[PDB]
Amino acid sequence: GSMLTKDIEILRRENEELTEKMKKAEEEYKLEKEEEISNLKAAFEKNINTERTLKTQAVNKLAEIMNRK
């Protein structure tokens, strides 16, 4: 067979495999940006569900105390 025919086929395949190294490259970059935040939030929450609880308790106690003053 002619070499030209083959070189062309091999090129349509690389450019093709390259397109698969994109769609499954982006699908990849997803967990990166998705994980780094799927815990960057859940981390900022625990930290606020803590301060918020201490805030509420102090407030309620103040109310209890003043209603008794």
């Binding site: 407030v59 103040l62 109310a63 003043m66 209603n67």
Partner: protein
């Protein structure tokens, strides 16, 4: 000497504390710190009457809603505030403060007050409010609101320049002096 109780409410950061401190302590609070609750006293004379004004400061912070009702008992007059540089705090007058006050202080004279009058013509303020496509509150707007919520009267002021401060309290006292 008639002893009268005044309570002030309104959105957080709208100027309640500075207004009370300027009038009772002759000074202007420097730094802003959300109020839990505090109490001041001040002397005033109107209609030829000597009056010791008890000033109850309250929290505008939603998070402190729980404590506010502790200040409302036996109130002679209420100063319901909003900031002239914040249309949002104005909308909160009929949406929150009015229903709450009329529940805890039935038939208590309400003086609607518009703080920070000095910002009405401030470029930075108009500039900023422009971003949210808003503009400082107009006097007609505050008066409208006063009538709408059935206030004893409307008064604008600036604890910064002292303009109107006196009128606010002479009106409130007269109100607390009705019958």
């Amino acid at each position: 000497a008639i002893r009268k109780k005044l309570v002030i409410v309104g959105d957080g950061a709208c100027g309640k504390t500075c207004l009370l401190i300027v009038f009772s302590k002759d000074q202007f609070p420097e730094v802003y710190v959300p109020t839990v609750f505090e109490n001041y006293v001040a002397d005033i004379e109107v209609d030829g009457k000597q009056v010791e004004l008890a000033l109850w400061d309250t929290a505008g912070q939603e998070d402190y809603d729980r404590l506010r009702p502790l200040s409302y008992p036996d109130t002679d007059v209420i100063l319901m505030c909003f900031s002239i540089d914040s249309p949002d705090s104005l909308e909160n007058i009929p949406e929150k403060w009015t229903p709450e006050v009329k529940h805890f202080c039935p038939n208590v004279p309400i003086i609607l007050v518009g703080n920070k009058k000095d910002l009405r013509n401030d470029e930075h303020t108009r500039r900023e409010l422009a971003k949210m496509k808003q503009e400082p509150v107009k006097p007609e707007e505050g008066r409208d609101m006063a009538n709408r919520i059935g206030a004893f009267g409307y008064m604008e002021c600036s604890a910064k320049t002292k303009d109107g401060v006196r009128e606010v309290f002479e009106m409130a006292t007269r109100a607390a002096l009705q019958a």
